[model samples]
Target chain A: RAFTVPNIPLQTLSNSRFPSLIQGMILSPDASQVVQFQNGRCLIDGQLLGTTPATSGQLFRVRGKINQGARTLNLTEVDGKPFMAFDSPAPVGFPDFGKCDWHMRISKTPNNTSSGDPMRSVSVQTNVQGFVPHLGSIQFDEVFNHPTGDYIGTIEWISQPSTPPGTDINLWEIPDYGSSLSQAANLAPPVFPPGFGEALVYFVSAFPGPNNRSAPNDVPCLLPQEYITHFVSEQAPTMGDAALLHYVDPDTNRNLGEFKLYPGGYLTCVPNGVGAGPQQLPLNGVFLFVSWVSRFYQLKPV
Target chain B: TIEQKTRAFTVPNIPLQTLSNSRFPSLIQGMILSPDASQVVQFQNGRCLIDGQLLGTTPATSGQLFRVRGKINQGARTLNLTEVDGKPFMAFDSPAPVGFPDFGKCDWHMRISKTPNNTSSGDPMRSVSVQTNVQGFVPHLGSIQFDEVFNHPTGDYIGTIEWISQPSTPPGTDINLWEIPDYGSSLSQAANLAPPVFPPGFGEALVYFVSAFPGPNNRSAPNDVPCLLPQEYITHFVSEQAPTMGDAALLHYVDPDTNRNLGEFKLYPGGYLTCVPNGVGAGPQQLPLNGVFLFVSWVSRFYQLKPVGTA
Candidate 1:
């Protein structure tokens, strides 16, 4: 079904059935993931646990199972802990940026707002335009003010929010590429937006053609006409026009020997003479290790 | 100029080291051409075939062991690649009457065993492995701290990963740090997190959230488990490429608000996962996970948890 892949929209867990939200998937901008609810003290997937309350950290530790209607939907306890002893369905509103309001509130013990519970209540509001869900994840688009220092205000979600399932929303007005937004992309390496960093070097076959010691033949070499403006050094290598000089399709000319590097420093292409042979190798090729490959991240031109 | 015969080819360490370095969002092509250059065996991503019959269908990716047998018939003028060791498991090759196929989950033919710990070593020790034919992530456990806590090669550091709040979509929604393991040694080593490892074997096997945990607002004594735990987790630093218990990614918890890289997580050599003032991988020499971003302002290996300032 279009929904099983993302069984988390309009889900209302009320002490009777359904597990509280654990985590949402991010298949992209418009997909969601599955769920893992608890049955009393035992954890169960959707197929099981029919008409049962989920694992309550507090209550489940005490009473194995609570009798149906033994507790109200708002104050059900599974693991000796109160079930959402609190909730604020009233949508809250976002201030200052976009005129948006938001809804959603949850608490652990049986309490209402600051009066009953001692824990901090996560209550907030914003217009639908300001907040969007990428299945289980979310994205908030707003204006910012980092004119001088670091992250004083404006921030973009590393994994920006995509469209929620079965929801309709117009494209929000976001800054195009060539803006400061682009700089933030690779700002943190190693953890590339949640990634990590390390030195990356490309392994270029120094001598594309084998020396007599390795291959007893006139090893293939790129003729001057095949130079493709290649240049080299201990630290860097440039295949200026190798892209243009690479061999023709395998069915036509060369099988290996075209030199190129992938965005993340992968030695994607290398130099191989046309119609070399049915042998694989410990043979050598030039190596190029790169730490960075940048481009203007932009939306495809419509 | 012509010659043809078939034998197992010898792949080396350097080439494998070069390939294990990063995420290939692009598919690079490698070709094994016929002596006459007329017949070619070109492959990339996870697909490889020759002028031979259909061996089993295994999605082609590097790091797999193919006991693929083929011959260069001197008289026939054709290369006949016959069988793959584990043909039964490979997907169906519809063209001819042949069971020889390629199935994933094949072998850890080539994996880097150790990671060069410490950022200043300049080089990152990372490699890819296929554990028992299962093409997933694992860790490098070749460290003295094996039973206690096998570590990743990337010494110390806590970086950034966005937060999500439910079991709906999890582990690492692009935020790898948040991702729990389900592959190779990750499955096994995760069982070793005695100080309370997450329960496994399901979609929500190790689900985590950025929201308040132990919800339900009403309790006599809260279970004290916060939704977003700030505790130091002794993690096995393996990744998609470097799959070993002793050599993956190891991290340190940090609060960038004040630029404090408080060493919290315990790792090999009884060390914390963060640098002191300006740590080794603090943008100086690169570490296992440091080569990604090149932005000067943002710290690499072990950065602070601050927001986007003037860079």
Candidate 2:
């Protein structure tokens, strides 16, 4: 029995009006068939998933995170057995499971909504109170920016940790707005990505942090490696600014380096997806863009 | 008194060059005070000519910071510094620079702050800054100026640091800045913070511009500056993460030794923020965690380090 990443609670989504915001984008369901990994072999729901190009036909899901305190969700196992103890800082591995991203299947769940529920799709974010920071995924919706109008997902970083410049560490902690940017007068402490409810967007590097001082870190390295990681969930600062998860490319918008935003931007393709393969990342002979299993995802909607 | 010192850096007029990108700073003359405590030696279109030398071209108004300045003389395709009145001093002008490699030297932290009451600006706003000094010469390009950036998220982000360009008096009290939630408030979490933040812990962590260890894993910090470290002593990482969090990370470096494996200063959700003191100041062994603001080190994997004095 492999492990499962808990899905956002159905009622929680209902309360947050998540699906209605994006319409058929993210349908309702009790939970999802997420990622399960064991040994070096990948099982699509416990079956062999292939990655051979051209004749390729299938979508598979894998799970990982920035485990508790470590800044990296470095994979160290191949079928419950120990392998390379760590991965490079930027989520590297091309052609290998360690270096590529996984794709997720999409559809809808038939959870009941209050017939009297007054929510009508608008530009507000879903899930606030019940959703904690670390307990969510980087979900992509098809009703929004899917190139082929199919709901699908890409590989995401899991058990990922926040590697803030260690100012304070390992201490008894609790939830408290007791700490924030209220103290800095005339200062705009820290801020989360402003949301624009287009039902599509990218949570680039989660935005910036409020370590008291302003920092220039503009992108997020959420994927296991530059070429592998994929976007999952969406985030916003306030409850109303959630957009369609669609964001401008770093080169096109922010002054961030193109290399800094390598793992961002993707589209959900229709079945037997007719999409070009990931570009090659051959730096110093370290040929990347090779995760056979990390190529495409099936975007079927319920 | 604002301790005076002469840490001089210089730049020559270059070509197709209008503003300084991360690879180059625009100005090489008088510093422009944005009044926000940020200054630019040169900007987008401003021209500068300090000390009768034709350095670089930039914007007249503050557009960018830490660049050398000068104006383009389409008449000669040459770049020149400006007179005190903002006029180009054509005599000091040189052919517009066409590429990289060091052309000259100037200084930072000492450039006049265009803002008022700068000294009172305190700490980072008033901390010492410096331009990377190029030692070797590449005829066609001269020398490359690799500027040192600032670090310290809320930790003296720019205060605990200073440059020794000579011609200067050290300051006394270096004030610090920040407030609470400052912990969760780090930049890695801002825009809001999907991914974590990685500071270029310059002093607290050894930033290798180049590395050569094979099978490249963490520990061999890839970006080791490509210089040989013959008698390098790697002190065990005397650091900690939120214990119960059980999360692991590493700092990859060419042993010449290494773990955060790429230096992951990690923690548990809600974990209290703990900081390691700067290595260069508080003593040594800080891995030079000094400049996450504008500079970074990469994993070079058996990459060679530049020899001392080599650009």
Candidate 3:
């Protein structure tokens, strides 16, 4: 008997989802939440507490988690410095204790309206290891036409291991440095160690509000709720790499694009949290990054 | 009794166009003959069949009569013949059957009467009468008046011979002569004549006025009447010899207002003839040989003969 026609049918194939080991972790103000595993590392809160000479200036040391799958360090801070901080309290029900930092600097300006000397000014800088230090300054005389009024300045920074650590090695200068008003600035390039990945950074500012009693020179504490400006930077993946960096402003929750640090560079800033008084200590801002090392590790393969 | 010596004369072929100024109203009036053997012929208004099937009125005054010179054959017998009208005078032996009696006969006659007056809606109220001498012959009197024939009873006749007192060698009167006192010239000179005078016992002639005043009114005169000749009557008139035929056989009448040919029908021997009505067909008749045919024609001439006055 002749065989019947074979029952063959056409077929289509689709890509399938597969799980792979990759490295990443969220950086918070508390130490217990830091993730630790084989080939992964982090610096808990208060780990880098010692302060150096005032003349030596402020330097930020970054430390965060590393995963074996990611094969890179996902640093949230440098030397106990957080990347971003809210001056105003987080939205209701938000965790009060989160990894973030706040910083504030105050100065007085001359009464340019009158025949007087230029106002006194204050400058702040944060040094990221193996990268140029981030710096900002503001003069009170530039901020206010009157000599008597005080001025405040702030900045926020985030560090990511995906960036080539020293890619952005410069000092951020505040505009109108001679006057009392605060201004944003950038620093020149700096040297870096060989074979580094990417880093992230951010900046923020806070102003005086009601319910504060201390002198304006004191650091400002955060109020219950207030809006703040933020600047964020994340790891920018290289071509053929699947790793992506993303960020959203906690206040507005707007998505900032994925980014990475320039090779041999670091990011740093001074954040200002929302508050009434000027006497409180600075709070660290929050930073988050997804660090991957396939590209960097493959460069010097065994 | 003096036997009227009848002399036969062939009126030479008068070109229909040269028949100018002839006091005769129609050059070709009553029945005529066909000019061709075609079953159907075309004229200006319409078509016509040889068997007196008149589809349309004749287009011209002349070229509408049939003339027969010898005897006409009807099956076995033959009869003496003469010319009637030419182009469209009478018809015979039509391919289609005819309504009148004596089918297949070559003989025919014509009758002219004023269109009946329309007392019933859409009908004009008009009447007509024929004029003849005592012997029933319509004399060719030069400038003879039509009132004598159209307004008198059939039996009451007028003498064509002008003077009865002088019997020998009488004066020849041109029958076409008649004077209208109101208009300067004789009634014959008017472009169009007035309606025929009603007979003594008849009612007044109904006048249908047309919308255009100072122009020709829709009035019927004896000459304007359509003389319809049945194929049989026409065959009879044309087939019989002139002397033996009644002398009063011709139809003649005159209008008093215009000395126009009131109406006239004559039979001439030798296959050539002229039948004219005053305002109807006032021209010669030309017929086609080789067929049993009939012809009828009506002619109306309009002339603007007024002296132009400076505006």
Best by DockQ: 1
Model 1: what TM-score for its first chain?
0.16
Off by over 4 Å in 1: A1-302, B1-211, B217-240, B245-264, B267-311
Cα-based TM-score, every candidate: 0.19, 0.18, 0.12
TM-score of chain A of each: 0.16, 0.15, 0.18
Model 1 score (lDDT): 0.18
Instruction: Please report the candidate that would top lDDT against the real structure.
Output: 3
CA deviation > 4 Å runs, candidate 3: A1-258, A261-291, A294-302, B1-311
> Candidate 2 lDDT, tens digit per residue, B123-198?
2222223332222111112111123332222111111111112211232211111100111111222111112212
Query: Each candidate's root-mean-square deviation in Å?
Result: 26.6, 28.3, 60.5
CA deviation > 4 Å runs, candidate 2:
A1-218, A221-302, B1-142, B145-311
Worst 10 residues of 2 chain B by lDDT: B230-239
Candidate 3 structure quality by residue, lDDT tens digits, A157-222: 111111333332111211111112222121112222222322122122111111112111111111
In model 3 chain B, where is the ten-residue run with the lowest total lDDT? B208-217
Could you arrange the candidates by lDDT from highest to lowest?
A: 3, 1, 2
Q: For candidate 3, state the interface root-mean-square deviation in angstroms to 1 decimal.
A: 65.1
lDDT of 2 by residue, A1-302 (tens): 22111121111111010000001111011112121111112111222111101000011111223222222222221111222221211111111111111122221111122111111110101122211212222222122221221111122111111233333211011111111222111111221221121111111211111222233212211111111100111111221111112112223332111111112221121212122111111111111121112222222210
Taking chain A of candidate 3, what TM-score results? 0.18
Error of 2 at A119 (Å): 51
Please report how far candidate 1 places residue B110 from its true position, in Å.
46
List lDDT for all candidates, in order.
0.18, 0.18, 0.19
